[PDB]
Design a protein around this motif. Structure first.
Motif, PDB file in Angstrom:
ATOM      1  N   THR A 133       0.821  -1.209   0.000  1.00 31.89           N
ATOM      2  CA  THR A 133       0.000   0.000   0.000  1.00 31.89           C
ATOM      3  C   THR A 133       0.857   1.261   0.000  1.00 31.89           C
ATOM      4  O   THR A 133       0.545   2.229  -0.702  1.00 31.89           O
ATOM      5  N   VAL A 134       1.951   1.268   0.770  1.00 28.43           N
ATOM      6  CA  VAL A 134       2.800   2.456   0.821  1.00 28.43           C
ATOM      7  C   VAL A 134       3.450   2.716  -0.531  1.00 28.43           C
ATOM      8  O   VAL A 134       3.550   3.868  -0.969  1.00 28.43           O
ATOM      9  N   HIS A 137       0.948   4.464  -2.556  1.00 29.32           N
ATOM     10  CA  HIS A 137       0.869   5.892  -2.253  1.00 29.32           C
ATOM     11  C   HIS A 137       2.080   6.647  -2.787  1.00 29.32           C
ATOM     12  O   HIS A 137       1.934   7.720  -3.384  1.00 29.32           O
ATOM     13  N   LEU A 138       3.287   6.113  -2.575  1.00 31.34           N
ATOM     14  CA  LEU A 138       4.483   6.816  -3.032  1.00 31.34           C
ATOM     15  C   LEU A 138       4.483   6.995  -4.545  1.00 31.34           C
ATOM     16  O   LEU A 138       5.029   7.982  -5.056  1.00 31.34           O
ATOM     17  N   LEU A 141       1.509   9.718  -5.439  1.00 36.05           N
ATOM     18  CA  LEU A 141       1.886  11.085  -5.103  1.00 36.05           C
ATOM     19  C   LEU A 141       2.761  11.736  -6.166  1.00 36.05           C
ATOM     20  O   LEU A 141       2.951  12.957  -6.123  1.00 36.05           O
ATOM     21  N   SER A 162      -7.749  -1.949   0.661  1.00 36.21           N
ATOM     22  CA  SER A 162      -6.579  -1.093   0.827  1.00 36.21           C
ATOM     23  C   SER A 162      -6.406  -0.166  -0.368  1.00 36.21           C
ATOM     24  O   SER A 162      -6.110   1.024  -0.203  1.00 36.21           O
ATOM     25  N   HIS A 164      -8.852   0.813  -2.458  1.00 35.02           N
ATOM     26  CA  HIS A 164      -9.983   1.735  -2.455  1.00 35.02           C
ATOM     27  C   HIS A 164      -9.769   2.862  -1.451  1.00 35.02           C
ATOM     28  O   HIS A 164      -9.982   4.040  -1.767  1.00 35.02           O
ATOM     29  N   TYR A 165      -9.338   2.520  -0.233  1.00 37.72           N
ATOM     30  CA  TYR A 165      -9.052   3.544   0.767  1.00 37.72           C
ATOM     31  C   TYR A 165      -7.891   4.428   0.330  1.00 37.72           C
ATOM     32  O   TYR A 165      -7.898   5.642   0.566  1.00 37.72           O
ATOM     33  N   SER A 169      -8.159   8.656  -0.162  1.00 38.94           N
ATOM     34  CA  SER A 169      -7.231   9.521   0.552  1.00 38.94           C
ATOM     35  C   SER A 169      -6.315  10.283  -0.399  1.00 38.94           C
ATOM     36  O   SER A 169      -5.914  11.410  -0.088  1.00 38.94           O
ATOM     37  N   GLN A 170      -5.973   9.699  -1.554  1.00 35.75           N
ATOM     38  CA  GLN A 170      -5.243  10.458  -2.565  1.00 35.75           C
ATOM     39  C   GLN A 170      -6.075  11.626  -3.077  1.00 35.75           C
ATOM     40  O   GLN A 170      -5.560  12.737  -3.253  1.00 35.75           O
ATOM     41  N   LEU A 173      -6.578  14.235  -0.409  1.00 38.92           N
ATOM     42  CA  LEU A 173      -5.383  15.044  -0.186  1.00 38.92           C
ATOM     43  C   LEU A 173      -5.420  16.324  -1.012  1.00 38.92           C
ATOM     44  O   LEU A 173      -5.041  17.395  -0.522  1.00 38.92           O
ATOM     45  N   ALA A 296       7.810  12.030  -4.962  1.00 40.23           N
ATOM     46  CA  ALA A 296       7.144  13.042  -4.154  1.00 40.23           C
ATOM     47  C   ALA A 296       7.732  13.084  -2.752  1.00 40.23           C
ATOM     48  O   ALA A 296       8.037  14.161  -2.231  1.00 40.23           O
ATOM     49  N   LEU A 297       7.911  11.919  -2.136  1.00 38.50           N
ATOM     50  CA  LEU A 297       8.475  11.811  -0.798  1.00 38.50           C
ATOM     51  C   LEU A 297       9.858  11.184  -0.906  1.00 38.50           C
ATOM     52  O   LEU A 297      10.014  10.115  -1.509  1.00 38.50           O
TER      53      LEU A 297
END
Lengths: 446, 446
Positions: A133-134, A137-138, A141, A162, A164-165, A169-170, A173, A296-297
């Motif tokens: 999942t991370v 996200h990475l 982003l 995971s 879908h959530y 949240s993206q 944001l 991004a991060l």
């Protein structure tokens, strides 16, 4: 070439027996060139399984484990490799990073050479890191940088929670409305799987406003294998970034992420890849974006190793996806994955996909034959599915799932009525599939 | 009470010997109530270390390992605990999550009960997850929500590179100018450490525009322990969120994150906490924010376990920091940390901090005594430092660092001239410190 159902009745013709006779399964294992790989894995005994009603089972008999899709069995070599790294850590504590025959500093960047053939990518297009999942996200982003004209994200109906959530949240944001921005392709009424044309139509009608398309490689509840290179071509024509969540795909089906033109991808290690529970996950970025799409991060293992330990804070970023690597890699999780990936290198991914089609097919044949009170939700075309089949039953007065696991059949149950069976080519044999359906038969007959 | 230098000369008075005699060190170990904990760790032998010039060392002799600060030694119980979990995975593959005496589903949420006393927080204020830098980003993406009036981030000069890169990228995410937005407190000219008053003055002058203050608990290059509860009070008065990167602090110094009012924190597992290289990291959010500050990036192990596996995608988030948990926890890394945290529970954190002050102090006394060609950059006050001391030398014609590691002294070298020595209370004895300085003496005399 020969379709799997055609293959079974031909074997029966050679043996002059019924297609559903045990001799057919026993013969498919005799001729299984991969049968010896099952030895490399720890296979549970039935009496050791908690839900087992011991009255209903023969003890001292291997369990039918069809959860290669959910938590994959342990290679026997895993503890052996852990011991190598634990002794090095006990022998030269901090020197294991840069000294010796195998520096820790290069682990995640060497065993990627065992991942190339599993996802179909290059050395520099993959990093093994963080968790699934991370990594999702990475990646988002960076690839999900929306505009007023282009702001949507395209995913599938009843996607994995995971994912879908992670998409809400993206969008939350950047302040985007969820109902407007989440374009969720739902299946037609009375249908369980998605239609490739229905997906392409939405991409053509709406793609000019979609910023990122993010499906799973194989949908968890249906087992449907999505035509990945098609969605990519369609999405990229309308100007979309296309990436997939290859959790149930990687280690299961053949993947060519580089040639297919996929922009990014992410997967986990503990399903078909048989690493440890919560094991190290992986990422993917096609090399076309190696110098355009930036992290991004940012962490410090995004810095070139050559001057990373000067620590002068003058960032020199690694191109490609190794730039999204924030932190020091967990060496002992890479260790385990190395043990499993060496096994995938022995039994070629092609040789596993070939058995996977005949093995899952021999499950589908024995289910359709005897039965209709059973609905195989998984697509029937041999190319639109993987190891997993999903079932629903019309027996009202018996819980099939509880009755199955009482007897040593380890498989999933997914709400509402879905149960998932996934014979994998590494440790599962046709005799497992034969033994399964005769329990499923003995149960459905009451 | 007795200052460490006072303690040494008093011991010498009891033995009627010189303060720098070996008998002083041998006596401090006799009276060390924690001396038996060194047995619980694997301590390298000198001839096994790569940089060792065997001509200059006595072989078959323990190595002086002063990198407890960089990669901590292995507890001998680590392999024992790994074996428990590897057998469970080989015995009940997927059933280890919910069945048996120790479900995997509760590991990260049970061994937090071993972290409470190490950071000074509650059950629900800590999660052990992901990696350090990523937890730093996942926290910042919630606490760093800037406005035109309030947009800055306050960090320290020459901060750790991963932190520094993580802050630029946090500011670059929101489009902020780096020079204007990164407020970097630099030390006064000709000074190596920071002044607590200089920090507070900036917070008072500029705090109305600072959105987040983010220091390290102990600065890596100087070893300076920052007055954490002071910075928090000052920062929170001006309306700032205050959090620290407790990498070199956790497992080293006593921490009271909850009582101190710290908003958030993050740390790693492989330094003083002696988990594996790249081991599982941790996060912290004071319970005041349990219902106000929400996760920016959401996974499915942010969902309440009670309805997480229905997978109905109707999110019910876990309050506090367990909501930032995206993914399934890596069980085998939690396993290792459990082995180390049980040792921290035996030798109380208070008992280690007490020895750490006398042990590092006995290093400082033996350095200042004989020598000035050595500059201890680390603050001299026993409360403004931890295990680590940082040194710089004025011997021009010898590289002290190379000469030290030739002889089995494992310690860091940090650009430009800094070398870091960190005797830790678990495996390091005063006789290690005595043996160290006489090599450092034999070297500096040429």
């Amino acid at each position: 070439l020969e379709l799997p159902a055609d293959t079974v009745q031909r074997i029966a013709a050679e043996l002059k027996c019924h297609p559903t006779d045990e001799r057919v399964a026993l013969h498919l294992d005799e001729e299984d060139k991969l049968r010896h790989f099952r030895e490399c894995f720890y296979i549970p005994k039935i009496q050791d399984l908690p839900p087992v009603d011991l009255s209903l089972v023969n003890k001292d008999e291997d369990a039918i484990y069809f959860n290669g899709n959910s938590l994959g069995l342990q290679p026997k070599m895993v503890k052996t490799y852990l011991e190598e790294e634990l002794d090095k850590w006990a022998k030269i504590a901090i020197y294991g990073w840069f000294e010796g025959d195998s520096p820790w500093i290069h682990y995640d960047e060497s065993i990627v050479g065992l991942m190339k053939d599993i996802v179909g990518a290059n050395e520099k297009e993959i990093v093994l890191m963080n968790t699934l999942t991370v990594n999702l996200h990475l990646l988002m982003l960076s690839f999900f940088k929306p505009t007023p004209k282009r702001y949507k994200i395209l995913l599938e109906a009843k996607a994995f929670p995971s994912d879908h959530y992670a998409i809400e949240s993206q969008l939350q944001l950047h302040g985007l409305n969820i109902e407007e921005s989440m374009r969720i392709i739902k299946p037609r009424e009375g249908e369980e799987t998605l239609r490739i044309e229905d997906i392409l139509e939405v991409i053509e009608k709406e793609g000019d406003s979609i910023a990122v398309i993010l499906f799973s490689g194989i949908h968890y509840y249906t087992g449907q294998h999505f035509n990945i290179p098609a969605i990519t071509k369609a999405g990229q024509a309308k100007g979309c970034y296309v990436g997939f969540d290859l959790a149930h795909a990687v280690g299961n089906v053949e993947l060519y992420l580089h040639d297919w033109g996929v922009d990014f991808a992410c997967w986990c290690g503990y399903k078909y890849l048989n690493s440890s529970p919560g094991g190290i996950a992986g990422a993917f970025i096609h090399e076309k974006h190696a110098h355009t799409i930036k992290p991004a991060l940012v962490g410090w293992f995004g810095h070139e190793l050559s001057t990373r330990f000067k620590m002068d804070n003058k960032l020199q970023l690694i191109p490609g996806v190794c730039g999204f690597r924030c932190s020091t890699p967990p060496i002992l999780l890479v260790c385990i994955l190395h043990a499993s990936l060496e096994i995938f290198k022995q039994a070629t991914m092609k040789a596993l996909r070939k058995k996977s089609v005949l093995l899952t097919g021999y499950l589908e044949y024995l289910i359709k034959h005897n039965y209709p009170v059973v609905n195989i939700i998984t697509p029937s075309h041999v190319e639109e599915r993987g190891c997993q089949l999903t079932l629903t039953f019309n027996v009202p007065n018996k819980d099939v799932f509880q009755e199955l696991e009482k007897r040593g059949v380890v498989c999933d149950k997914r709400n509402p009525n879905g149960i998932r069976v996934a014979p994998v080519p590494l440790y599962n044999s046709f005799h497992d599939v034969y033994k399964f359906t005769n329990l499923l038969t003995s149960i459905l007959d009451s």
